[PDB]
From Swiss-Prot, chains B, I:
Its main location: nucleus. Changing E48Q: In a breast cancer sample; somatic mutation. The modification N6-(beta-hydroxybutyryl)lysine is found at K16, K62, K76. Core component of nucleosome. Nucleosomes wrap and compact DNA into chromatin, limiting DNA accessibility to the cellular machineries which require DNA as a template. Histones thereby play a central role in transcription regulation, DNA repair, DNA replication and chromosomal stability. DNA accessibility is regulated via a complex set of post-translational modifications of histones, also called histone code, and nucleosome remodeling. The modification N6-crotonyllysine is found at K1. This is Histone H4. GO terms for molecular function: DNA binding; protein heterodimerization activity; RNA binding; structural constituent of chromatin. The chain holds residues 17 to 103 of 103 of the full protein. The modification N6-methyllysine is found at K5.
Swiss-Prot record, chain D:
This is Histone H2A type 1-B/E. The gene is H2AC4. It comes from Homo sapiens (Human). The keyword RNA-binding does not apply. The nucleosome is a histone octamer containing two molecules each of H2A, H2B, H3 and H4 assembled in one H3-H4 heterotetramer and two H2A-H2B heterodimers. The octamer wraps approximately 147 bp of DNA. The modification N6-glutaryllysine is found at K86, K109, K110, K116.
UniProtKB/Swiss-Prot annotation, chain E:
Belongs to the histone H2B family. This is Histone H2B type 1-K. The chain holds residues 28 to 125 of 126 of the full protein. The modification N6,N6-dimethyllysine is found at K31. The modification N6-acetyllysine is found at K59. The modification N6-malonyllysine is found at K90.
Curated annotation (Swiss-Prot), chain H:
The modification N6-(beta-hydroxybutyryl)lysine is found at K21, K44, K87. It comes from Homo sapiens. The modification Phosphoserine is found at S22, S51. The modification N6-lactoyllysine is found at K21, K44. Acetylation is generally linked to gene activation. Acetylation at Lys-87 (H3K122ac) by EP300/p300 plays a central role in chromatin structure: localizes at the surface of the histone octamer and stimulates transcription, possibly by promoting nucleosome instability. H3R2me2a is present at the 3' of genes regardless of their transcription state and is enriched on inactive promoters, while it is absent on active promoters. The lineage of its organism: Eukaryota, Metazoa, Chordata, Craniata, Vertebrata. This is Histone H3.1. The chain holds residues 37 to 136 of 136 of the full protein. Its main location: nucleus. Belongs to the histone H3 family. The modification N6,N6,N6-trimethyllysine is found at K1, K21, K44. It is found in: Nucleus; Chromosome. One of its GO terms (biological process) is telomere organization. The modification Phosphothreonine is found at T45, T72.
Length: 99, 87, 99, 120, 98, 84, 100, 100, 87, 65
């Protein structure tokens, strides 16, 4: 029997290094194709989306989200904590000015 | 005649693994439990705002299709210029 | 229905007999049976309802005649109370003599 | 024999009693047979709601510089909330008070009033 | 004659203990114990008063957890319903798996 | 003696203002004072006639506090505190 | 020297709407309210003896309904552009509320 | 009374008198079938409404609305005006106690 | 087939004349112009509140059909008490 | 929305400050003029609750209990 259970928080450092070195999108295309379709229904119905329009919306949306999480992390390391939490996300948005 | 489900994907597909894959690119090491409902509230107020300006350009040309040059034109106004997805 | 179906209970036969005593040669529509049958089944759940609580506060375990006389005094209004507390005692008097 | 025992509340880890909400639910004639999974659910909904009158009230006692949750500090916490003023919305709290509010039109702002000997 | 003063029963030890977990420094004056026993004896009356109607309308004879849960979804307002239904479900789950 | 007039002239003019300056009113007309003695003698009649009815049911001659907490509860205005 | 700082009509009434709205005591005097409760109970059953905690649970519910009909007659006298509550306002609040 | 013109506000008194003396529902049945169906989608999907359920909802919803208008009217005649307006509806809801 | 579902135009389904016939039974003589949008706000909150309690009873019985003795059992709790269209 | 904030402060002229107390309150007009700086505006009153006087009570060691 070899449990080989790496201690908590050491599998993730290997995960961070491998993920930061590749460019493939991390949210699946079929589910995202629908979230845009639902948020478009209210503005007008009978709107037909070309293939590129869903792709651009995926690259901008991943990029806003990747960033908010590098600023939430910077705020967490300030309070002496090492983990992101719900309260930290709201200091980053008040300071950046989005409100 | 109608997909029995009319949920139009209720902020879904952003499953725990996807939010634990985007955060790890960021640098986050120990994501806390309540973040997942909040990060499905911030994505939501963004996908709507690029969209409201995107439809507003298409109705101006009277066409019924939202082409990618319309999304690149809307994204410049808010503040982030995507380069090349549409050109 | 009649496929071994259940039989409902209605205070509709009884209401027709009362209509005959007060006003002879007059009839009721089936829509007007529906408003009347509900009233007879709503005054039952307010007059009986105050009686249950009155028994518990005192500590006693039985809903006897005195309790349905305090409920009629409180739930009903002004002169539709003196004319109904009096009418009920007269019928209890007769039953005590014979059943 | 027969062993030794511990409180039912501890077994489910709830502070509010779970053996007294079974007698009071069966000796009030609410229903003939009480399920045994219902005293435990109803000793947790009361406890969650107890903290909603014990935490918002305490936070309003520090703000007035006192160490006891007296009767008024209970009104300033059940009348300043939007989901606890729509449940306890008819109740009157003994020796409480009113929440401060003066409608704006009344506040002094007549601006010299006028109609007098031409102030010009 | 005899002593045996009827022993009044009140949920007042349990309110002091919840004050201690939520805030470890404050204390409750006697009147607030009075305005708190009444709250506990009022929410209990509403939740077991809509359970009994629900048990009877759908012909049935016992109040099981689902029945004491339909009431919390109806009597409590908007947000407090979602948090409370979850808080109970975690507490019953621990009881069965023990 | 419970002189009828004296009992109702008991809610005096100063206390029909200080019970109204706790609501926000800034100027009070002269005739408010008469009407507001009228609406506190048709409220007490209704609360003190449904505390007597419970008292008689238990064959007692004292109107206890719990009975008033049960008269107010029926008409839609529960009182928490001066009772149990 | 004939100026006792006589306050203009309206500055000694906004310093009392602000000292009575921040206190918890009872405005009606206790002894004159122990005779209204007894005159209104000498017509229903003669010789009824009130307890000492039920002549205070009636004061605290007849002083919290009046301070609740004076915030619905100061939201109806500001709808006709007036600042003075008048006896045709108390009568309107009752018809809408349901107590006519 | 040339059929060409009756002075403003005189056709309506004939309308009020005729309308108050009959009981037929005043909102069309097919459009109201839909409003209920749309509101139901959020609470659950796959809900099938029996014919009576949409009838009761029509005879309660008309009754709440017929009432708000009589109380809005009482408020309007107070300010010396003779017409209902947007502001008057809000005073009726605060006094009745629904909005909070 | 029926390849369409009910949009949200329904709240404007109440017409401008219908709110002028439910107000002429009320005694109203000169309805003002802005009232029509407000009366589509008061009806809109009410129809949801009878509805949420109606669905909550049906899901208790694990059925899929909202029968009228469910509307009549929801309308009693909120305040009214329809007598008639139900038992 | 600026004149209505001049009666409240008892003056008959809409001076530069009364312009900030009207464009820094309304949510539609503070999301359009949200970067602009008024010439002598000042600031809108706000003290965060955590630092208000005492509250947690400055007793510290509080020798005794």
């Amino acid at each position: 029997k070899k449990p080989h259970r790496y201690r908590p928080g050491t599998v993730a450092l290997r995960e961070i290094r491998r993920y930061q070195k590749s460019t493939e999108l991390l949210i699946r295309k079929l589910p995202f194709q629908r979230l845009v379709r639902e948020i478009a229904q209210d503005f007008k119905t009978d709107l037909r989306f070309q293939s590129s329009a869903v792709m651009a919306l995926q690259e901008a949306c991943e990029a806003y989200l990747v960033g908010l999480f590098e600023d939430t992390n910077l705020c967490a390391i300030h309070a002496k904590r090492v983990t992101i939490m719900p309260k930290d996300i709201q200091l980053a948005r008040r300071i950046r000015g989005e409100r | 005649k109608r997909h029995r489900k009319v949920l139009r994907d209720n902020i879904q597909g952003i499953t725990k693994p996807a939010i634990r894959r985007l955060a790890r690119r960021g640098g986050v090491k120990r994501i806390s439990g309540l973040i997942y409902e909040e990060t499905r509230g911030v994505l939501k107020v963004f996908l709507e705002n690029v969209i409201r300006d995107a439809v507003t350009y298409t109705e101006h040309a009277k066409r019924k299709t939202v082409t990618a040059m319309d999304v690149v034109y809307a994204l410049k106004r808010q503040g982030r210029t995507l380069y090349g997805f549409g050109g | 229905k009649k496929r071994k179906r259940s039989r409902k209970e209605s205070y509709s036969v009884y209401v027709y007999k009362v209509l005959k005593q007060v006003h002879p040669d007059t009839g009721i529509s089936s829509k007007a049976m529906g408003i009347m049958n509900s009233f007879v089944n709503d005054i039952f759940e307010r007059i009986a309802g105050e009686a249950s609580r009155l028994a518990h506060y005192n500590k006693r375990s039985t809903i006897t005649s005195r309790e349905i006389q305090t409920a009629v005094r409180l739930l009903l209004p002004g002169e539709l109370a003196k004319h109904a507390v009096s009418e009920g005692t007269k019928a209890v008097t007769k039953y005590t003599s014979a059943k | 024999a027969r062993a030794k025992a511990k409180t039912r509340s501890s077994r489910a880890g709830l502070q509010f009693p779970v053996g007294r909400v079974h007698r009071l639910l069966r000796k009030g004639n609410y229903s003939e047979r009480v399920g045994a999974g219902a005293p435990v659910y109803l000793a947790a909904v009361l406890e969650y709601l107890t903290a909603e009158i014990l935490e918002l009230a305490g936070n309003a006692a520090r703000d007035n510089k006192k160490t006891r949750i007296i009767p008024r500090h209970l009104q300033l916490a059940i009348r300043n909330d939007e989901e606890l003023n729509k449940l306890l919305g008819r109740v009157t709290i003994a020796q409480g008070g009113v929440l401060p509010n003066i409608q704006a039109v009344l506040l002094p702002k007549k601006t010299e009033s006028h109609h007098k000997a031409k102030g010009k």
